[PDB]
Design a protein around this motif. Structure first.
Motif, PDB file in Angstrom:
ATOM      1  N   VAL A  22     -14.831   8.690  -2.638  1.00 50.94           N
ATOM      2  CA  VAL A  22     -14.545   7.255  -1.769  1.00 50.94           C
ATOM      3  C   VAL A  22     -15.633   6.259  -1.770  1.00 50.94           C
ATOM      4  O   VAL A  22     -16.338   4.950  -2.100  1.00 50.94           O
ATOM      5  CB  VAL A  22     -13.662   7.710  -0.261  1.00 50.94           C
ATOM      6  CG1 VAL A  22     -13.153   6.338   0.023  1.00 50.94           C
ATOM      7  CG2 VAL A  22     -12.918   8.400  -0.502  1.00 50.94           C
ATOM      8  N   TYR A  29       1.034  -1.260   0.156  1.00 53.57           N
ATOM      9  CA  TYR A  29       0.119   0.397  -0.037  1.00 53.57           C
ATOM     10  C   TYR A  29       0.531   1.071  -0.192  1.00 53.57           C
ATOM     11  O   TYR A  29       0.517   2.286  -0.310  1.00 53.57           O
ATOM     12  CB  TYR A  29      -1.240  -0.095   1.147  1.00 53.57           C
ATOM     13  CG  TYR A  29      -0.081   0.021   2.387  1.00 53.57           C
ATOM     14  CD1 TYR A  29      -0.642  -0.545   3.207  1.00 53.57           C
ATOM     15  CD2 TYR A  29       0.456   0.836   2.953  1.00 53.57           C
ATOM     16  CE1 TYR A  29       0.103  -0.958   4.641  1.00 53.57           C
ATOM     17  CE2 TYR A  29       1.154   1.283   4.342  1.00 53.57           C
ATOM     18  CZ  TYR A  29       0.600  -0.062   4.965  1.00 53.57           C
ATOM     19  OH  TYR A  29       0.921   0.347   6.246  1.00 53.57           O
ATOM     20  N   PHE A  71      -1.613   9.275  -3.771  1.00 59.01           N
ATOM     21  CA  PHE A  71      -3.401   9.082  -4.215  1.00 59.01           C
ATOM     22  C   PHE A  71      -4.184   9.537  -2.829  1.00 59.01           C
ATOM     23  O   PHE A  71      -5.470  10.260  -2.979  1.00 59.01           O
ATOM     24  CB  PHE A  71      -3.563   8.193  -4.666  1.00 59.01           C
ATOM     25  CG  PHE A  71      -2.536   7.562  -6.227  1.00 59.01           C
ATOM     26  CD1 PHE A  71      -2.779   8.860  -6.906  1.00 59.01           C
ATOM     27  CD2 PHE A  71      -2.195   6.771  -6.387  1.00 59.01           C
ATOM     28  CE1 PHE A  71      -2.067   8.386  -8.477  1.00 59.01           C
ATOM     29  CE2 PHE A  71      -1.394   6.176  -7.548  1.00 59.01           C
ATOM     30  CZ  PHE A  71      -1.246   7.821  -8.057  1.00 59.01           C
ATOM     31  N   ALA A  72      -4.126   8.317  -2.009  1.00 58.33           N
ATOM     32  CA  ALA A  72      -5.207   8.389  -0.038  1.00 58.33           C
ATOM     33  C   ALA A  72      -4.488  10.147  -0.530  1.00 58.33           C
ATOM     34  O   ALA A  72      -5.670  10.541   0.240  1.00 58.33           O
ATOM     35  CB  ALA A  72      -4.107   7.205   0.255  1.00 58.33           C
ATOM     36  N   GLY A  73      -3.301  10.673  -0.488  1.00 58.42           N
ATOM     37  CA  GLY A  73      -3.514  11.529   0.359  1.00 58.42           C
ATOM     38  C   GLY A  73      -4.559  12.814  -0.895  1.00 58.42           C
ATOM     39  O   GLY A  73      -5.058  13.657  -0.049  1.00 58.42           O
ATOM     40  N   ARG A  74      -4.830  12.682  -1.915  1.00 60.31           N
ATOM     41  CA  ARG A  74      -5.249  13.991  -2.878  1.00 60.31           C
ATOM     42  C   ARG A  74      -6.786  13.649  -2.047  1.00 60.31           C
ATOM     43  O   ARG A  74      -7.844  14.276  -1.822  1.00 60.31           O
ATOM     44  CB  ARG A  74      -4.997  13.176  -4.419  1.00 60.31           C
ATOM     45  CG  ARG A  74      -3.477  13.193  -4.684  1.00 60.31           C
ATOM     46  CD  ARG A  74      -3.654  13.822  -5.920  1.00 60.31           C
ATOM     47  NE  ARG A  74      -2.215  13.127  -6.779  1.00 60.31           N
ATOM     48  CZ  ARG A  74      -1.952  12.756  -8.050  1.00 60.31           C
ATOM     49  NH1 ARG A  74      -2.794  12.908  -8.915  1.00 60.31           N
ATOM     50  NH2 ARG A  74      -0.851  12.329  -8.008  1.00 60.31           N
ATOM     51  N   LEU A  75      -7.354  12.413  -1.551  1.00 60.00           N
ATOM     52  CA  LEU A  75      -8.783  11.512  -1.450  1.00 60.00           C
ATOM     53  C   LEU A  75      -8.876  12.415  -0.777  1.00 60.00           C
ATOM     54  O   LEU A  75     -10.376  13.001  -0.239  1.00 60.00           O
ATOM     55  CB  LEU A  75      -8.861  10.649  -1.418  1.00 60.00           C
ATOM     56  CG  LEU A  75      -8.804   9.929  -2.877  1.00 60.00           C
ATOM     57  CD1 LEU A  75      -8.300   8.275  -2.902  1.00 60.00           C
ATOM     58  CD2 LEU A  75      -9.854   9.848  -3.530  1.00 60.00           C
ATOM     59  N   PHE A  76      -8.199  12.728   0.231  1.00 60.80           N
ATOM     60  CA  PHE A  76      -7.686  12.790   1.726  1.00 60.80           C
ATOM     61  C   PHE A  76      -8.541  14.514   1.836  1.00 60.80           C
ATOM     62  O   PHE A  76      -8.961  15.223   1.773  1.00 60.80           O
ATOM     63  CB  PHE A  76      -7.242  12.300   2.519  1.00 60.80           C
ATOM     64  CG  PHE A  76      -7.066  11.718   3.956  1.00 60.80           C
ATOM     65  CD1 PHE A  76      -7.150  11.720   4.469  1.00 60.80           C
ATOM     66  CD2 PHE A  76      -7.848  10.471   2.995  1.00 60.80           C
ATOM     67  CE1 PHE A  76      -7.555  10.251   5.805  1.00 60.80           C
ATOM     68  CE2 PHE A  76      -7.768   9.489   4.248  1.00 60.80           C
ATOM     69  CZ  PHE A  76      -7.838   9.402   5.221  1.00 60.80           C
ATOM     70  N   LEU A  98       2.546   2.249  -1.983  1.00 57.34           N
ATOM     71  CA  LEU A  98       3.052   2.912  -3.338  1.00 57.34           C
ATOM     72  C   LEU A  98       1.740   3.591  -3.894  1.00 57.34           C
ATOM     73  O   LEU A  98       1.848   4.692  -4.517  1.00 57.34           O
ATOM     74  CB  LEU A  98       2.764   1.730  -4.612  1.00 57.34           C
ATOM     75  CG  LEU A  98       3.360   0.534  -3.841  1.00 57.34           C
ATOM     76  CD1 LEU A  98       3.682  -0.688  -4.977  1.00 57.34           C
ATOM     77  CD2 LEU A  98       5.121   0.582  -3.408  1.00 57.34           C
ATOM     78  N   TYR A  99       0.225   3.583  -2.740  1.00 56.46           N
ATOM     79  CA  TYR A  99      -1.003   4.648  -3.609  1.00 56.46           C
ATOM     80  C   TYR A  99      -0.497   5.331  -1.999  1.00 56.46           C
ATOM     81  O   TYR A  99      -1.887   6.040  -1.788  1.00 56.46           O
ATOM     82  CB  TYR A  99      -1.140   3.419  -3.580  1.00 56.46           C
ATOM     83  CG  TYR A  99      -1.463   2.617  -4.382  1.00 56.46           C
ATOM     84  CD1 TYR A  99      -0.515   1.348  -3.723  1.00 56.46           C
ATOM     85  CD2 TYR A  99      -1.730   2.458  -5.047  1.00 56.46           C
ATOM     86  CE1 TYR A  99      -0.506  -0.061  -4.493  1.00 56.46           C
ATOM     87  CE2 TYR A  99      -1.266   1.023  -6.310  1.00 56.46           C
ATOM     88  CZ  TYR A  99      -0.780   0.190  -5.650  1.00 56.46           C
ATOM     89  OH  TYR A  99      -0.438  -0.889  -6.639  1.00 56.46           O
ATOM     90  N   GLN A 100       0.489   5.872  -1.253  1.00 53.62           N
ATOM     91  CA  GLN A 100       0.449   6.860  -0.279  1.00 53.62           C
ATOM     92  C   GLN A 100      -0.298   8.176  -1.117  1.00 53.62           C
ATOM     93  O   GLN A 100      -1.323   9.494  -0.618  1.00 53.62           O
ATOM     94  CB  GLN A 100       1.345   7.259   0.518  1.00 53.62           C
ATOM     95  CG  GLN A 100       1.716   7.828   2.414  1.00 53.62           C
ATOM     96  CD  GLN A 100       1.378   5.469   1.942  1.00 53.62           C
ATOM     97  OE1 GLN A 100       1.975   5.240   3.095  1.00 53.62           O
ATOM     98  NE2 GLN A 100       0.241   4.972   1.666  1.00 53.62           N
ATOM     99  N   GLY A 139     -11.680  15.629  -0.287  1.00 55.43           N
ATOM    100  CA  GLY A 139     -12.151  15.752   1.019  1.00 55.43           C
ATOM    101  C   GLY A 139     -13.301  15.462   0.260  1.00 55.43           C
ATOM    102  O   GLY A 139     -14.654  16.235   0.674  1.00 55.43           O
ATOM    103  N   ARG A 140     -14.277  14.213  -0.605  1.00 56.30           N
ATOM    104  CA  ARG A 140     -15.047  13.959  -1.108  1.00 56.30           C
ATOM    105  C   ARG A 140     -15.376  13.072  -0.883  1.00 56.30           C
ATOM    106  O   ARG A 140     -15.370  11.622  -1.856  1.00 56.30           O
ATOM    107  CB  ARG A 140     -14.907  13.869  -3.046  1.00 56.30           C
ATOM    108  CG  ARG A 140     -15.311  15.716  -3.169  1.00 56.30           C
ATOM    109  CD  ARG A 140     -15.383  15.348  -4.934  1.00 56.30           C
ATOM    110  NE  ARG A 140     -15.135  16.826  -4.818  1.00 56.30           N
ATOM    111  CZ  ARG A 140     -14.503  16.770  -7.005  1.00 56.30           C
ATOM    112  NH1 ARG A 140     -14.213  15.361  -7.759  1.00 56.30           N
ATOM    113  NH2 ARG A 140     -13.998  18.056  -6.978  1.00 56.30           N
TER     114      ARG A 140
END
Lengths: 209, 206
Positions: free
Chosen positions: A201, A182, A188-193, A184-186, A196-197
């Motif tokens: 998710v 996982y 992106f996870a960041g972007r989502l957070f 490797l996908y930090q 805040g949509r």
């Protein structure tokens, strides 16, 4: 008695579906389902199979060797659901299980108890669930007479019960996944957070459950 | 159309195909092998890896073909994998990208395969070369009478970013009614704010 018993209402047709939801919510390591005929054991097993449960059918037509291996499968965890007829079901070679379910009802009281004893992975603890049809209510009162006990009248699982259970299953997947994969996908996870949509998710969960 | 020879070992060959695929994102791609054994093998590798691919051969029932090609035409299938024999026919349409997984046994095979690229415009053609084909690359290169641009495989980072955009796409196709069911759960996740957890989500879809 150190196990609990619940009478749960179901429609003979939607019977499979109710059961499937029972299992999903309850999530037991081992469960047996009892029915009248070896053919049902079959339907139900195939059914549950496509419904996404590890189910096998236990009958006496099963060869000596076939049986012995359906049982081992069960003790390991490879099979998590056994669907048997009361006859096929006699034996000391049967494990104790987390949950017992009466699909169709047992006519007389002794069948009830032989069936019900297989729960309680100690002699102490265990859940038994009876499925009754809309008219079979009179049949249930009758058993309680025989068995000399009052069963609890509990509803089938609500959709959001299941939704809830599925979500629990999912955190379970994530648990497994190791940083090695996982990490490797930090970003992106960041972007989502940081965006805040919830909707996005929510979308992501949409096709994981 | 353009022609690009892309350096790649046969042993990891599959991975960059996937890469080129993600990074190019063609509506239609066709990939060419020489035995039902590999068309087969490769439709699997690509479906595995994320791409809507199906294989094309003879064993394939007459009727069944029609359905596959339809699906490829529909764009329900975006990648087709085919032998040369299976590939012949006027039912096979023009694609956005033509890939030579392995090479043609002649300038005819080449101009037959590549013929399939470009529709209404030029096309594109990728020729995948392992290190010890470098010599015989020139062999067929001049055999056909042209020089293919030597261009490198996509970046891990290039690939990753692409994978991402694809995902967004998928997500975007989720019907409002569907995901509505998971807004609460979603909220639960932002609420604890363990990016790592959401990472583990992502890990499960890429």
């Amino acid at each position: 008695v150190t196990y609990e018993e619940e009478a749960v209402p179901a429609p003979v047709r939607g019977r499979l579906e109710v059961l499937s939801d029972l299992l999903y919510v309850a999530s037991p390591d081992r469960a047996m389902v009892f029915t009248r005929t070896k053919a049902e054991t079959e339907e139900i097993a195939q059914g549950l199979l496509r419904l996404g449960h590890p189910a096998q059918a236990l009958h006496g037509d099963l060869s000596q060797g076939e049986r012995e291996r359906v049982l081992g499968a069960f003790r390991q965890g490879e099979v998590r659901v056994l669907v048997a007829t009361d006859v096929a079901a006699r034996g000391l070679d049967i494990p104790q299980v987390d949950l017992v379910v009466h699909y169709r009802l047992p006519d007389r009281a002794e069948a009830y108890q032989h069936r019900s004893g297989r729960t309680g992975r100690a002699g102490r603890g265990g859940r038994v669930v009876l499925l009754y049809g809309p008219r079979e209510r009179r049949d249930v009162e009758a058993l309680e007479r025989a068995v000399g006990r009052r069963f609890k009248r509990v509803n089938p699982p609500t959709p959001e019960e299941v939704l809830e259970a599925k979500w629990r299953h999912l955190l379970a997947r994530l648990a497994r996944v190791p940083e090695k994969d996982y990490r490797l996908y930090q970003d992106f996870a960041g972007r989502l957070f940081a965006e805040g949509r919830v909707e996005v998710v929510a979308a992501l969960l949409a096709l994981l459950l």
